[PDB]
Assembly symmetry: C2
């Protein structure tokens, strides 16, 4: 009946929302990982900077 | 006799000049070694960064997938 397609419609919305909650949690995890790698990169570039300044001193 | 007095001094002069240049070379040697170590380190660190950048590239694709 009318109350049968409302159910269907709502059940559909429900499952779609569950599907998107999951896709978002997976993306969240990848973003966290990207985040870590980025952090490391910045750290390594600071070390490079230190070495580059050491060289500069020595060159003079 | 007298030309000996002179020649001895010309030789002494050459001797100390060479002693000076030997020290100068030693100094330049360690400077270059140091600079060299640092460069090597820099290259090593840049490769690590390259690894991380590739890791990100991957993660971004799989995430976009």
């Amino acid at each position: 009946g009318a109350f049968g397609k409302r159910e269907q419609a709502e059940e559909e919305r429900y499952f779609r929302a569950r599907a998107k909650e999951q896709l978002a949690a997976l993306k969240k995890h990848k973003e966290n990982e990207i985040s870590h790698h980025a952090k490391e990169i910045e750290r390594l570039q600071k070390e490079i900077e230190r070495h580059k300044q050491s060289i500069k001193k020595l060159k003079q």
